mmCIF file of C-alpha atoms and ligand atoms in Angstrom:
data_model
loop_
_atom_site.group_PDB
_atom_site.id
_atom_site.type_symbol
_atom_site.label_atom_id
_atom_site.label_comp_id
_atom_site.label_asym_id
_atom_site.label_seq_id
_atom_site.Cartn_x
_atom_site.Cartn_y
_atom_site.Cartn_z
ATOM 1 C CA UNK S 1 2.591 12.136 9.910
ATOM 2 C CA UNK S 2 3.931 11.159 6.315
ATOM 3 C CA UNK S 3 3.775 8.092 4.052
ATOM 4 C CA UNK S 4 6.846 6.062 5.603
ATOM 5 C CA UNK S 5 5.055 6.354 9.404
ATOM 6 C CA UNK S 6 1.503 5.526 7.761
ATOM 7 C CA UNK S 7 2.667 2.920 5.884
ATOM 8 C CA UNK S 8 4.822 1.644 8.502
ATOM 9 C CA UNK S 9 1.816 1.425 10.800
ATOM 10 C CA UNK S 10 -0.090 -0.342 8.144
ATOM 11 C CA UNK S 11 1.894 -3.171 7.460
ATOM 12 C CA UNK S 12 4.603 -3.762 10.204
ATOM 13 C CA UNK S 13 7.636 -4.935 10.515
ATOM 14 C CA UNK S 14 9.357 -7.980 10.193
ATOM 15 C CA UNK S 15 12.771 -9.243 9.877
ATOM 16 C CA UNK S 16 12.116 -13.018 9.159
ATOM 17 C CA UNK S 17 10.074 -14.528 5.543
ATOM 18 C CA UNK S 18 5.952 -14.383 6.895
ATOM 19 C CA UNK S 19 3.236 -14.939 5.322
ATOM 20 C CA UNK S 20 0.959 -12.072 4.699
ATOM 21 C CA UNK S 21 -3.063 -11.445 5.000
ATOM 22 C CA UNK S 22 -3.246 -13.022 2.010
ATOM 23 C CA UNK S 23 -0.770 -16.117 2.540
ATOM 24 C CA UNK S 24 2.162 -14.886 0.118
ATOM 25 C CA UNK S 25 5.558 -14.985 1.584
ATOM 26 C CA UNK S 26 6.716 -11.346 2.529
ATOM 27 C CA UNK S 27 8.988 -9.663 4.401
ATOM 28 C CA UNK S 28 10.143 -6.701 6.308
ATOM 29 C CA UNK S 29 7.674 -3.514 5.621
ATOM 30 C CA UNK S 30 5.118 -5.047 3.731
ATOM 31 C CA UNK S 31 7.567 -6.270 1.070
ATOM 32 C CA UNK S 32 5.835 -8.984 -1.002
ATOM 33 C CA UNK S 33 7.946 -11.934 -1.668
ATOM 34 C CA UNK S 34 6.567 -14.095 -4.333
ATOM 35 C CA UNK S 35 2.678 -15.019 -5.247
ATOM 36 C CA UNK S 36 4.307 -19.081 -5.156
ATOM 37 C CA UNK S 37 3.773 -21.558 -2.144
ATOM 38 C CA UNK S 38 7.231 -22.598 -2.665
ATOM 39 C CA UNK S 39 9.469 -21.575 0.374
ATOM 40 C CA UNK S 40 12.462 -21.636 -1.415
ATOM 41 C CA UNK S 41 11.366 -19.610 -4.318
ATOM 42 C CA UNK S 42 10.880 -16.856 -1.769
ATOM 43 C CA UNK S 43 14.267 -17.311 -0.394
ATOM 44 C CA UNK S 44 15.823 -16.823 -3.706
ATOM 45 C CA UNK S 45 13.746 -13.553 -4.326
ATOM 46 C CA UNK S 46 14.728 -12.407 -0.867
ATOM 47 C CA UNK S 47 18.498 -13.009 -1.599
ATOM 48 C CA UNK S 48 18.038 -11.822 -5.213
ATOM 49 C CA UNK S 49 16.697 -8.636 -3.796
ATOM 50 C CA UNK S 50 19.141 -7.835 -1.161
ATOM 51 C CA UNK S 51 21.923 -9.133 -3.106
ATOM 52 C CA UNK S 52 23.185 -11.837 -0.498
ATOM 53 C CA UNK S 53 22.295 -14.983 1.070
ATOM 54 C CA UNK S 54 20.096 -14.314 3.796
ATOM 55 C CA UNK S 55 18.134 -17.386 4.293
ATOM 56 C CA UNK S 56 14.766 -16.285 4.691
ATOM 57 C CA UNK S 57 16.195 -13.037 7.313
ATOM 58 C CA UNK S 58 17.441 -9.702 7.028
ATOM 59 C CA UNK S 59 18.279 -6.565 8.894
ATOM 60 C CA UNK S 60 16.042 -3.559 10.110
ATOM 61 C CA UNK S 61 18.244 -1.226 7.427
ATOM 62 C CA UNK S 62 17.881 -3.668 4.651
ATOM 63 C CA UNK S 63 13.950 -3.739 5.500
ATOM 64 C CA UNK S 64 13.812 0.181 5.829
ATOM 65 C CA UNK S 65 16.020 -0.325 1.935
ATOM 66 C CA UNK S 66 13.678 -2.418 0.518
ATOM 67 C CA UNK S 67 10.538 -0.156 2.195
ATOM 68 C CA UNK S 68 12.545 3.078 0.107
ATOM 69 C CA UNK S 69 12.301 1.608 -2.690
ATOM 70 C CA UNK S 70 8.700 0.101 -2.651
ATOM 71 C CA UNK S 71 7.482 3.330 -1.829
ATOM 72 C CA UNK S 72 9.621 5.244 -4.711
ATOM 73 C CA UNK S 73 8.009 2.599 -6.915
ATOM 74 C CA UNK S 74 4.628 3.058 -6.291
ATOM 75 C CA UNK S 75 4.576 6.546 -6.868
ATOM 76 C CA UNK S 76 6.357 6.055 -9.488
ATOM 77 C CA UNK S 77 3.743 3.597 -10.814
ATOM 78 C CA UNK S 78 1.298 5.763 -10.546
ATOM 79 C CA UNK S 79 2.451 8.805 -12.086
ATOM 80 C CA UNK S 80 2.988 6.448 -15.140
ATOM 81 C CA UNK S 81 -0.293 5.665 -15.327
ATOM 82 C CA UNK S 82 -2.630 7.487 -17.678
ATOM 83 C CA UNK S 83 -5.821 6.734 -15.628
ATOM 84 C CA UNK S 84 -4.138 7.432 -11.900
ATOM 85 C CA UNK S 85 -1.945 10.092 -12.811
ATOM 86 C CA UNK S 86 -4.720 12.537 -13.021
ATOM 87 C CA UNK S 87 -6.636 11.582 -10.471
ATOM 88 C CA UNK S 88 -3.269 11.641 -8.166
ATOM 89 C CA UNK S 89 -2.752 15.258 -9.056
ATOM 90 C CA UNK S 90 -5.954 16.776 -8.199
ATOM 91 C CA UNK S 91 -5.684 15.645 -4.609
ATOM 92 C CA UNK S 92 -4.296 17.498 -1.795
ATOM 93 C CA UNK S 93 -1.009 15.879 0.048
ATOM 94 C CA UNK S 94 -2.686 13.818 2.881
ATOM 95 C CA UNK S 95 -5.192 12.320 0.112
ATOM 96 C CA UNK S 96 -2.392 11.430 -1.967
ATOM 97 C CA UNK S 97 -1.154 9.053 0.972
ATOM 98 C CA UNK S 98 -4.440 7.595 0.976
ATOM 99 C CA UNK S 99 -3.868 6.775 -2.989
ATOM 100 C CA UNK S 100 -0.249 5.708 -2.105
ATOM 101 C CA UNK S 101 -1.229 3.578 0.739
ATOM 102 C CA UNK S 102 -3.481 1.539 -1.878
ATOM 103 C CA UNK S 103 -1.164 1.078 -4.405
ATOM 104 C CA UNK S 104 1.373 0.134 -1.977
ATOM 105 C CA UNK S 105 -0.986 -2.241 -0.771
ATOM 106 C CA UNK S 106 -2.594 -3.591 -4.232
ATOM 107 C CA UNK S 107 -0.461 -2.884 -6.836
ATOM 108 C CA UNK S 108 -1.185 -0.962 -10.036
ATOM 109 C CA UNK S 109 -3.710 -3.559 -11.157
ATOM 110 C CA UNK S 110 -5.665 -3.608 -7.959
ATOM 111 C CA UNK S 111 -6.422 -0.630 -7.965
ATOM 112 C CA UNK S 112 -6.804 0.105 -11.681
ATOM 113 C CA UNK S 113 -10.746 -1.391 -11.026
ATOM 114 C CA UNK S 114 -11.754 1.420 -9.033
ATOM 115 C CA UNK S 115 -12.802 3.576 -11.317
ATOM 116 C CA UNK S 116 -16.205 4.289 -10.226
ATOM 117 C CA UNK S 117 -13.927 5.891 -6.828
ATOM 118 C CA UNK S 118 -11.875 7.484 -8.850
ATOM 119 C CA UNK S 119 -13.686 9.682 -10.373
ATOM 120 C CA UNK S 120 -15.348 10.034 -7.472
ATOM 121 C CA UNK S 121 -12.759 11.472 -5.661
ATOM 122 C CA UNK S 122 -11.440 13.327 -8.807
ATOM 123 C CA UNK S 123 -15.071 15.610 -8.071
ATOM 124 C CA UNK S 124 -14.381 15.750 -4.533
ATOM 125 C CA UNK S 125 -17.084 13.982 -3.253
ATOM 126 C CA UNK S 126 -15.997 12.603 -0.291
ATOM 127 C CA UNK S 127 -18.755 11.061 1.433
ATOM 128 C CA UNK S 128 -19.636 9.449 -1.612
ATOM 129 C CA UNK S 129 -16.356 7.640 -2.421
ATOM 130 C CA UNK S 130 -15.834 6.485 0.742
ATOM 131 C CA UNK S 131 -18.967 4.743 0.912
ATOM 132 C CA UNK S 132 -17.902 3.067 -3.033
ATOM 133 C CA UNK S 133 -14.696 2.509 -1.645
ATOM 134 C CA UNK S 134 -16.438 0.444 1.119
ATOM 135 C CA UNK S 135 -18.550 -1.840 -1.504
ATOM 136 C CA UNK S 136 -15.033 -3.772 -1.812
ATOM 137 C CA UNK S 137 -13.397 -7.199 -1.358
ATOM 138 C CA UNK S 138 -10.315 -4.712 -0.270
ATOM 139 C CA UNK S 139 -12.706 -3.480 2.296
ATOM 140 C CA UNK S 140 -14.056 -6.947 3.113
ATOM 141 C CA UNK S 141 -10.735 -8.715 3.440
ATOM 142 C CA UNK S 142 -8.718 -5.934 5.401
ATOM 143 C CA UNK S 143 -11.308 -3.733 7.241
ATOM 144 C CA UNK S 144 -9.856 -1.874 10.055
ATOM 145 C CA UNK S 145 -7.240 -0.419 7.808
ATOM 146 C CA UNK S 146 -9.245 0.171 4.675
ATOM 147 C CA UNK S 147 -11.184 2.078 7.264
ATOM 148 C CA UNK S 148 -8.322 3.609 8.156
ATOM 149 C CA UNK S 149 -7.013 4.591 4.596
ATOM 150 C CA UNK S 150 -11.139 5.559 3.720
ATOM 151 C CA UNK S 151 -11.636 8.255 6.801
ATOM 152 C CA UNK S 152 -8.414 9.440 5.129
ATOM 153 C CA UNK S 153 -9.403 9.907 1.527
ATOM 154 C CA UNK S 154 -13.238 11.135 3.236
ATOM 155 C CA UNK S 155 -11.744 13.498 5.674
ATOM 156 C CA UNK S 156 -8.224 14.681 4.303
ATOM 157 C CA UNK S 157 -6.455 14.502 8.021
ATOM 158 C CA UNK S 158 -4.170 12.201 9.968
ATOM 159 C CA UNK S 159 -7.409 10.983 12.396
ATOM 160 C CA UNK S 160 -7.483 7.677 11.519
ATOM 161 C CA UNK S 161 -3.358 7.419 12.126
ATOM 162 C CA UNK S 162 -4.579 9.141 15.272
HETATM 163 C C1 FLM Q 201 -5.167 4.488 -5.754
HETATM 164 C C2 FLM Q 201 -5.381 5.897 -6.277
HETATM 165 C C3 FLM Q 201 -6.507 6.554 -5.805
HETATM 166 N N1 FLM Q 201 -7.281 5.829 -4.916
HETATM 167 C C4 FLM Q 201 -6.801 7.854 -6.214
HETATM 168 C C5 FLM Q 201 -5.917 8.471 -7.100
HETATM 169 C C6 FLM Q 201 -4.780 7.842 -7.603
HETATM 170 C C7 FLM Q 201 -4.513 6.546 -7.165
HETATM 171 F F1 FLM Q 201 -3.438 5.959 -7.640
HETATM 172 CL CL1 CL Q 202 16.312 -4.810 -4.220
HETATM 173 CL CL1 CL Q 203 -7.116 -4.745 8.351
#
């Protein structure tokens, strides 16, 4: 198990603009689109980011390009941040996909308002994080795999990926 399988699981894969959980056009691994209702606007972001007129599809290597590059990002993100960037280092390597997962997931921002988890987890109190990560419209809105991303930052193993 690494990041790329876990977050592969997570989000899927598609080759054709979808809407996500959230109703924001998307596409291949969990790329988001554009926050706008307007179809088109997500077409040009598409072909903006691929660098070619798709209309609205693309390819399972230009997906698995743009998933390379979201997940460089995010790490990325959060070693720039002053709050995360600590937190991120004191955690062993399956945690850190947890914490990568999230990001991926929430952006920056999203995740930037759980401090009260943060810390938690800085201590290494497992049980107790897990059940503050829970009190959460993240948890509320996608359950079964903030469960899944939870038993991982609770239990540092793969279980939960099975
Ligand atoms: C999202 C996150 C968590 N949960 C813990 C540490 C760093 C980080 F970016
Ligand atoms: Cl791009
Ligand atoms: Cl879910």
């Amino acid at each position: 198990m690494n990041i790329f399988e876990m977050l592969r699981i997570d989000e899927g894969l598609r080759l054709k603009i979808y809407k996500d959980t959230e109703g924001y056009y998307t596409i291949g691994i969990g790329h988001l689109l554009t926050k706008s209702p307007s179809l088109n606007a997500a077409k040009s972001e598409l072909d903006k980011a691929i660098g070619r007129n798709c209309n609205g599809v693309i390819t399972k290597d230009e997906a698995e390009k743009l998933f390379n590059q979201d997940v460089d990002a995010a790490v990325r993100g959060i070693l720039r941040n002053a709050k995360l960037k600590p937190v991120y280092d004191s955690l062993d390597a399956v945690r850190r996909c947890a914490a990568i997962n999230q990001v991926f997931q929430m952006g920056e921002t999203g995740v930037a308002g759980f401090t009260n988890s943060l810390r938690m987890l800085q201590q290494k109190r497992w049980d107790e994080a897990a059940v503050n990560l829970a009190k959460s419209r993240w948890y509320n809105q996608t359950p079964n795999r903030a469960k899944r991303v939870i038993t991982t930052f609770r239990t540092g193993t793969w279980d939960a990926y099975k």
